[PDB]
Design a protein around this ligand. Sequence first.
Ligand SMILES: Cn1cc(C(=O)Cc2ccccc2)cc1/C=C/C(=O)NO
Ligand SMILES: [K+]
Ligand SMILES: [K+]
Ligand SMILES: [Zn+2]
Ligand SMILES: [Zn+2]
Length: 366
Amino acid sequence: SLVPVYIYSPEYVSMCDSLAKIPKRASMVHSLIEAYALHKQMRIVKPKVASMEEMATFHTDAYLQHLQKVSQEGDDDHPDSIEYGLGYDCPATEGIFDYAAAIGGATITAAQCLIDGMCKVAINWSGGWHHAKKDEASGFCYLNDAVLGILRLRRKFERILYVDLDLHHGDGVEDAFSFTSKVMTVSLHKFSPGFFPGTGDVSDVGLGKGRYYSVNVPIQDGIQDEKYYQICESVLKEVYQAFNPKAVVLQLGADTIAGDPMCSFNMTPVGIGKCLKYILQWQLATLILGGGGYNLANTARCWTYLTGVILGKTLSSEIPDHEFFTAYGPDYVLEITPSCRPDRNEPHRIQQILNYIKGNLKHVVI
Ligand SMILES: Cn1cc(C(=O)Cc2ccccc2)cc1/C=C/C(=O)NO
Ligand SMILES: [K+]
Ligand SMILES: [K+]
Ligand SMILES: [Zn+2]
Ligand SMILES: [Zn+2]
């Protein structure tokens, strides 16, 4: 149809809530999307928990298995943990395996729907776990659903484009497809000394026949909706022309929005929204994902607003009373206001980058 597919299931939302770093976030988001009763304008779909075999299409058995053990326990001692990433920035708590599988399945489902012509846009705000390596958790990413969806997607579509708008660089997803030309990865993110993962400069382009098939736009603190769109809509224009994608997987981690603990970018869901609109306009099959977002209230407002955009709907400022109303204090409005920090993004260095890029995107043609 022309109607968007909204991957959802009360079981699933509960599952996602159990994640340490972002408790009750999944619920808060569905709850708010429901309060603006947008779900009514979408096609709900239950997540087909990823099979051991499906997850294994990108992750080593050794890893998936170890992730399983620990999940049915508590990583009792296991000094081998570090070998797989389980530690602090990826706590191997109990029953996370089911957690992973739940999410990875959802994203896979989303991709299935897109494949089966059931819709042009499939959503899974829980997904977006872009750091997970083929065999080693990373920055709260125990499973890389982002990649899985791309794989499942490549079944029907030839060239697939992955646009990562999370605050952090989408290393995991990028690596997975660093050596191929069938999948292109575009990532906007804060790049600085010490800032995790600290990978993906602009000189990062890919390897072998995957060279120039990995584009990275390093941004600096303070960037707002103004410049961000300029920068983004600029790159996405080139990428589109020189790549001609068949489908698109878009990660929209809200850890870039003003107010997020990450205190780096100074974006508001409206800006990210404009980027979303620009992509959607290509009317290719598109798989939407969540990801970072740690100022929960805000993360909810953001993704809800975006969901609105996806429906070409205009939401009212008044935050609809709902299960978490209290949380949107003290103004209870949808809009987010950019903090008052300077935008350390020198316009010279920027244009310098947008050329470096389009220049590399020149080869992609040739
Ligand atoms: C909150 N978080 C902490 C880490 C680290 O492991 C390390 C770190 C080290 C020095 C400065 C800042 C962060 C990674 C994340 C989030 C990733 C994310 O949301 N991906 O989508
Ligand atoms: K990113
Ligand atoms: K690539
Ligand atoms: Zn272990
Ligand atoms: Zn992030």
